[PDB]
Design an enzyme around this catalytic site. Sequence first.
Site, PDB file in Angstrom:
ATOM      1  N   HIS A  68       0.827  -1.230   0.000  1.00  0.00           N
ATOM      2  CA  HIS A  68       0.000   0.000   0.000  1.00  0.00           C
ATOM      3  C   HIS A  68       0.857   1.275   0.000  1.00  0.00           C
ATOM      4  CE1 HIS A  68      -3.297  -2.756   1.291  1.00  0.00           C
ATOM      5  NE2 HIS A  68      -3.940  -1.960   0.413  1.00  0.00           N
ATOM      6  N   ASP A 107      -5.064   5.851  -0.943  1.00  0.00           N
ATOM      7  CA  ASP A 107      -4.434   5.073   0.150  1.00  0.00           C
ATOM      8  C   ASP A 107      -3.381   5.926   0.918  1.00  0.00           C
ATOM      9  OD1 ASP A 107      -5.715   2.504   0.450  1.00  0.00           O
ATOM     10  OD2 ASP A 107      -4.615   1.645  -1.218  1.00  0.00           O
TER      11      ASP A 107
HETATM   12 MG   LIG Z   1      -7.291   1.198   0.535  1.00  0.00          MG
HETATM   13 ZN   LIG Z   2      -5.646   0.775  -2.703  1.00  0.00          ZN
END
Ligand SMILES: [Mg+2]
Ligand SMILES: [Zn+2]
Length: 313
Positions: A68, A107
Amino acid sequence: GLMQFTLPVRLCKEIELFHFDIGPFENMWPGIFVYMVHRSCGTSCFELEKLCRFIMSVKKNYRRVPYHNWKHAVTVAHCMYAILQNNHTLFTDLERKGLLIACLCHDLDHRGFSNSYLQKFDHPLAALYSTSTMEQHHFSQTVSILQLEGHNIFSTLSSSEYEQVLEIIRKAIIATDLALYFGNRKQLEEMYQTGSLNLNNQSHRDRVIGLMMTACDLCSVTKLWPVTKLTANDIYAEFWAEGDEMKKLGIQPIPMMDRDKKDEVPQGQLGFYNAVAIPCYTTLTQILPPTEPLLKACRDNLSQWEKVIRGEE
Ligand SMILES: [Mg+2]
Ligand SMILES: [Zn+2]
Ligand SMILES: Cn1cc(Br)cc(C(=O)Nc2cc3nc(-c4ccccc4)[nH]c3cc2C(=O)NC2COC2)c1=O
């Protein structure tokens, strides 16, 4: 004003394809993103000085986690760019502007742990946002970066266009919460089949942009097999670390997160493609037919996981 980004020939061509991999050269990702904005949007959408300062603050505020991370942000923005370019006339100028930024920001300041883990740990973010915890945080972090002196890439929008675009980005980022995907897709399936789907109904467009966001977010499963397989190591590295932390709280993790069960990964990928990925790109292909290459690439990768199980790789 007259200053394009240009890519080398192989990238200039492959960047238009759904299965494009942005490559291992980090210093080229910002230029790839700006290239995509200029082709999707115009060389005028954003002041270059301002866009460039927004992109480097966003980069700075992604962390060095296995999955991420900044590479994921740009990869998810590229898949959005490919959807927008294959469906030119369906989307407003505002929607093109907002969705690429939504994807780049979706994110921000992810720490590598699910909403579940924040709640069992009793993280402060879990008291401040009781559902879609990380996603409410990622939108919060986006608004914060936009309000740094010299970072407001939307400053030339009318007051009403500005409220519309922050609202598009807010719903877009909240929709990346996979817990909200299942119901959103069911409703879209029912609307498309009973014939009630209407893209002039804003609540219907909301739902459709939500599905697009899930499709871009899961786009690791739509790449060529070798990219899909190496990404899965990154994905499992965060999952198993989360598992280790669950054991430190005295809770057995779900198998997806338990590194003792590496053995069952191939079967667990089957479930994921069957319960999430295939139905996501199926409904997405019904509503937006030019996105079929995403569905076809996903079916090819399901078939490669089936081959792994049968001992043939
Ligand atoms: Mg996410
Ligand atoms: Zn993502
Ligand atoms: C968000 N996101 C982006 C991508 Br791309 C890939 C993933 C991803 O791989 N998901 C999964 C991997 C799994 N591996 C096992 C597994 C591994 C070993 C032994 C036994 C089981 N079970 C699994 C379930 C899921 C999963 O989420 N299932 C959904 C359906 O109900 C929630 C992802 O969650």
